[PDB]
Design a protein around this ligand. Sequence first.
Ligand SMILES: *[C@@H]1O[C@H](CO)[C@@H](O[C@@H]2O[C@H](CO)[C@@H](O[C@@H]3O[C@H](CO)[C@@H](O)[C@H](O)[C@@H]3O)[C@H](O)[C@H]2NC(C)=O)[C@H](O)[C@H]1NC(C)=O
Ligand SMILES: *[C@@H]1O[C@H](CO)[C@@H](O[C@@H]2O[C@H](CO)[C@@H](O[C@@H]3O[C@H](CO)[C@@H](O)[C@H](O)[C@@H]3O)[C@H](O)[C@H]2NC(C)=O)[C@H](O)[C@H]1NC(C)=O
Ligand SMILES: *[C@@H]1O[C@H](CO)[C@@H](O[C@@H]2O[C@H](CO)[C@@H](O[C@@H]3O[C@H](CO)[C@@H](O)[C@H](O)[C@@H]3O)[C@H](O)[C@H]2NC(C)=O)[C@H](O)[C@H]1NC(C)=O
Ligand SMILES: *[C@@H]1O[C@H](CO)[C@@H](O[C@@H]2O[C@H](CO)[C@@H](O)[C@H](O)[C@H]2NC(C)=O)[C@H](O)[C@H]1NC(C)=O
Ligand SMILES: *[C@@H]1O[C@H](CO)[C@@H](O[C@@H]2O[C@H](CO)[C@@H](O)[C@H](O)[C@H]2NC(C)=O)[C@H](O)[C@H]1NC(C)=O
Ligand SMILES: *[C@@H]1O[C@H](CO)[C@@H](O[C@@H]2O[C@H](CO)[C@@H](O)[C@H](O)[C@H]2NC(C)=O)[C@H](O)[C@H]1NC(C)=O
Ligand SMILES: *[C@@H]1O[C@H](CO)[C@@H](O[C@@H]2O[C@H](CO)[C@@H](O)[C@H](O)[C@H]2NC(C)=O)[C@H](O)[C@H]1NC(C)=O
Ligand SMILES: *[C@@H]1O[C@H](CO)[C@@H](O[C@@H]2O[C@H](CO)[C@@H](O)[C@H](O)[C@H]2NC(C)=O)[C@H](O)[C@H]1NC(C)=O
Ligand SMILES: *[C@@H]1O[C@H](CO)[C@@H](O[C@@H]2O[C@H](CO)[C@@H](O)[C@H](O)[C@H]2NC(C)=O)[C@H](O)[C@H]1NC(C)=O
Lengths: 147, 147, 147, 148, 148, 148
Amino acid sequence: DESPSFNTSTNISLTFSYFPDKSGENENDCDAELRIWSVQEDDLAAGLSWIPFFGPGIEGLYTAGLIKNQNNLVCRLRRLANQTAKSLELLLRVTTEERTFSLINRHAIDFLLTRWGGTCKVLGPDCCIGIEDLSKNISEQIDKIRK
Amino acid sequence: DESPSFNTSTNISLTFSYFPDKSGENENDCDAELRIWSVQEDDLAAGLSWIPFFGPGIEGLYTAGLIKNQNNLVCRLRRLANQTAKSLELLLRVTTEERTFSLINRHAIDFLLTRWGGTCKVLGPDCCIGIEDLSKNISEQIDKIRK
Amino acid sequence: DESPSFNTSTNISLTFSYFPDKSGENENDCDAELRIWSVQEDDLAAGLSWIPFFGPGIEGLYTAGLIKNQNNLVCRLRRLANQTAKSLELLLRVTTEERTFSLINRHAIDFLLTRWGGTCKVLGPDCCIGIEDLSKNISEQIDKIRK
Amino acid sequence: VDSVCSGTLQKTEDVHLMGFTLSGQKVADSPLEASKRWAFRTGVPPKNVEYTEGEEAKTCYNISVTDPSGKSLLLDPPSNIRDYPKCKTVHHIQGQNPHAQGIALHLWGAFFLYDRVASTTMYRGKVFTEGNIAAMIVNKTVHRMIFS
Amino acid sequence: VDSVCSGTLQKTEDVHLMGFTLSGQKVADSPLEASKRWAFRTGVPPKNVEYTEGEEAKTCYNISVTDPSGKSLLLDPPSNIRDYPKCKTVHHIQGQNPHAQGIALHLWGAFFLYDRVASTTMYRGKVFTEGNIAAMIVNKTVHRMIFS
Amino acid sequence: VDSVCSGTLQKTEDVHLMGFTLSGQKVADSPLEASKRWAFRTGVPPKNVEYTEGEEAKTCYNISVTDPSGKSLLLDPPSNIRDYPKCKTVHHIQGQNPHAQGIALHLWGAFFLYDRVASTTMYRGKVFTEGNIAAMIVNKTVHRMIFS
Ligand SMILES: *[C@@H]1O[C@H](CO)[C@@H](O[C@@H]2O[C@H](CO)[C@@H](O[C@@H]3O[C@H](CO)[C@@H](O)[C@H](O)[C@@H]3O)[C@H](O)[C@H]2NC(C)=O)[C@H](O)[C@H]1NC(C)=O
Ligand SMILES: *[C@@H]1O[C@H](CO)[C@@H](O[C@@H]2O[C@H](CO)[C@@H](O[C@@H]3O[C@H](CO)[C@@H](O)[C@H](O)[C@@H]3O)[C@H](O)[C@H]2NC(C)=O)[C@H](O)[C@H]1NC(C)=O
Ligand SMILES: *[C@@H]1O[C@H](CO)[C@@H](O[C@@H]2O[C@H](CO)[C@@H](O[C@@H]3O[C@H](CO)[C@@H](O)[C@H](O)[C@@H]3O)[C@H](O)[C@H]2NC(C)=O)[C@H](O)[C@H]1NC(C)=O
Ligand SMILES: *[C@@H]1O[C@H](CO)[C@@H](O[C@@H]2O[C@H](CO)[C@@H](O)[C@H](O)[C@H]2NC(C)=O)[C@H](O)[C@H]1NC(C)=O
Ligand SMILES: *[C@@H]1O[C@H](CO)[C@@H](O[C@@H]2O[C@H](CO)[C@@H](O)[C@H](O)[C@H]2NC(C)=O)[C@H](O)[C@H]1NC(C)=O
Ligand SMILES: *[C@@H]1O[C@H](CO)[C@@H](O[C@@H]2O[C@H](CO)[C@@H](O)[C@H](O)[C@H]2NC(C)=O)[C@H](O)[C@H]1NC(C)=O
Ligand SMILES: *[C@@H]1O[C@H](CO)[C@@H](O[C@@H]2O[C@H](CO)[C@@H](O)[C@H](O)[C@H]2NC(C)=O)[C@H](O)[C@H]1NC(C)=O
Ligand SMILES: *[C@@H]1O[C@H](CO)[C@@H](O[C@@H]2O[C@H](CO)[C@@H](O)[C@H](O)[C@H]2NC(C)=O)[C@H](O)[C@H]1NC(C)=O
Ligand SMILES: *[C@@H]1O[C@H](CO)[C@@H](O[C@@H]2O[C@H](CO)[C@@H](O)[C@H](O)[C@H]2NC(C)=O)[C@H](O)[C@H]1NC(C)=O
């Protein structure tokens, strides 16, 4: 469909838009606990932290987070990774570059292509456009016709 | 204009949107026959084909295809490659990276930039937006005014 | 906000959309003169210039330009570089690829994401869409109702 | 919501690729078991792909395998390959294979995970864990709450 | 249709870069003729660019050229350079140049084509064919019918 | 105009990344002063990033630094690192450090600028100047008038 999103609630309530129901998936084959690491993206916590030299270095480079299985999302995350694999291997088969691959930029482009590669049919499925303020203005114009 | 497209008919009828007429190009300086190769993008033909290990390997890696000169498209394809060259060399001059270059991602971005870098003038040239369902809804609203 | 643009006037009058006022920035800590170099992107000046072999080579590779401080833009350019640094270092921290990084493609994608990642509210801030020709057509339709 | 338009991506930074382990998928990870999923083969070019965040690993492996003559059967690590960030237990293994050729390829199609880099092959002397990755949209605000 | 909006690009995968040969452009490809289009030069940095599909090649070349002292005048191939996929006839050539310096650059501005990689220069010991590439949009459905 | 929609980007080519020097920021650039901004450190992986245009440099440096044993403390330059394009005065420096370890990292967080490549570290034997880069939109027409 489109890269799933990971929202907060409606502490730390989490929402994960991907459901494997949209694949025979039921019960649990995953750990509810999910501890994870990410590169320190802190904003001037040490003041000079942004500078490589004053940066923590590989040892203190990472930050830790925890995602709980509130809506069985973790397992859905877990499952998702398992299924992503095939397409990802096939993608890489095609690539000749061995050194790296920016999957990140690929997803960003594909996101845009899905919503803007094609042509829009106003107020239609598969296209994003908002007419509430346009139609309100159409209605406001008809209100101005008075006298 | 925009990356040409290669459609099927309206076996294997093919349509190629690029015409060099839009350049003194006439007759033929190309072979009508065009046999080509592409990396096996088959979907589980061998079941475990996606996995690198169970993948065919470099020798069986490629799939073969044939494009006929139904509308002299092959020669147009052929010509197109010849003209692409100059811009492509100039592009590469600018790049410092020698190892590789993702021309593929560049084209994808440029495609989007042409249709969305700018600002839209509804029902206008150079912009993609569909008003048939929006204007139909405007018309449906005027029909609802009855009684 | 969005990648600043560098326009010409409204010889060589120049306009630079970035103002650090949008940061305590006043007076001058920069040279008004700005001489710069860019890779020869000339179009067939030597006829065979595009071809690598017939290309000038590293020594004659560059072209020279001059940007004057007409509206103190150079210093704004200069300041801009100074502030870009932090975000740029943080960006690179995250990247594992050492060899290179296409910041250019990243900006192009982010440009599009800002104007099309979300959903549009017609005639609204933060979204680009043109209704002058659409509303004119709505008005032209109402004019056609006559008799 | 099930709509194509559901979800917003404001910057590319908000695309997050998370590495999840096979141990987190209740898969046997003992060295003797784990190695039954690894195999040597020729004609396949190793591929690498960058990712952004990953699960703390239960177990990891630091492996060197050669041929009898002492020449490694595992590829030398590229500049951008660093040891996996957070391993609870590392299994250091060093030895030789009597009759094997090519490079180490994961059988399941899973990836060899290092520090923000997933690979179709095993790199000599680098700490890795097995896993798969998944793509999702997380804005900075959501990101800040989790990692803090 | 001649409109900017004509054509749809749903995934990046649907961008296809095809390599067409110069032999397919009825250009003399005999080794003695072909070599008249190749030349050595300094001050130019070799550039490479990835492509997706290509024409079956009529002829290819597997060349090594050095200076009199035995040092190659051709660059060593990068990890990602593989022999051209489908050559009908390969011309293996190995020799030395008495007074040449720099790297091999195609005169016409055409590219040295390998396996899904086009280059402004000739790589030592790798099979290549001369050609140019062209960009187009092909969806999977169209792609599946052709290649099958 | 202050609007998000203000500004048009038609091709990716129109994104320009300009390198501005620290000398252009009225910063002392004498070798003895300049070197007070450079320092050695471990645990940091050098990063490089491509840019498109740059300011003519007032001063540049061509530096090689080793440890007492003669082994360079500076990284060997990658294929894509070329000497800075336009330096008015180059400061060639070659020596050794009695007790330093790791790689050369700029203290200010500024970049080591080469030919269309900015880096978090100093490369051995390559001409560089210190600076920062800035992103902007310039169409070809605007670009043609400036550079000509
Ligand atoms: C993962 O396992 C590898 C071994 O398979 C460990 O690599 C070892 O790292 C040390 C320190 O860099 C090396 O020791 C030094 O080697 C040089 C020669 O290269 C020698 O002159 C020094 O006196 C010293 O012994 C060691 O050789 C290297 N081994 C290999 C095969 O590369 C690595 O440290 C392990 N990782 C972790 C996180 O423990
Ligand atoms: C294209 O031509 C090159 C030669 O220009 C061919 O490369 C040759 O490949 C073989 C097999 O890899 C090499 O043979 C082996 O060399 C090692 C030493 O490196 C030696 O110990 C072995 O006993 C054996 O002889 C050969 O040296 C290599 N030549 C060069 C110059 O690299 C290549 O195979 C040709 N491609 C095709 C498709 O035929
Ligand atoms: C920047 O400074 C470096 C030195 O730190 C200069 O590099 C030097 O370049 C020359 C020419 O390539 C090298 O000379 C030759 O070296 C070979 C051995 O590699 C020798 O056989 C030749 O007879 C000749 O002497 C020199 O070794 C090299 N030095 C280093 C340390 O790499 C570079 O030229 C300077 N850049 C500018 C723009 O002046
Ligand atoms: C980051 O994403 C979150 C959603 O996961 C955004 O939060 C909600 O945004 C909507 C629309 O502005 C509001 O109606 C909600 O009240 C927000 N909820 C919370 C808890 O903040 C958030 O705005 C996004 N942040 C940024 C800076 O874009
Ligand atoms: C792949 O592209 C082809 C065109 O080359 C699409 O085929 C046509 O699509 C239109 C619009 O849905 C239909 O009106 C035609 O009848 C289709 N023709 C054929 C022969 O299929 C095709 O839909 C595209 N495939 C996908 C999955 O997007
Ligand atoms: C390049 O950008 C410039 C602006 O910096 C464009 O110039 C103006 O474009 C508008 C809209 O077409 C006109 O109303 C102005 O009269 C133009 N001014 C000048 C001096 O040309 C220019 O059109 C852009 N070029 C291209 C080819 O897109
Ligand atoms: C995703 O996880 C599943 C579940 O374990 C893996 O399925 C295993 O696949 C191997 C190889 O075909 C079998 O021997 C096992 O019996 C399977 N396990 C189960 C429980 O059925 C699957 O291979 C994994 N794939 C990836 C990419 O991780
Ligand atoms: C594209 O093909 C044309 C047609 O062959 C090439 O034109 C040749 O160019 C060379 C070098 O300038 C001349 O010596 C030949 O006489 C030209 N051929 C003809 C038939 O006129 C052109 O160079 C090719 N360019 C690329 C990029 O492939
Ligand atoms: C941007 O320029 C400013 C102005 O010079 C730099 O500020 C200097 O920072 C160093 C290190 O913290 C101080 O020792 C100096 O006193 C500062 N100068 C002034 C005039 O205040 C800043 O570091 C530069 N940053 C980048 C990325 O170039």
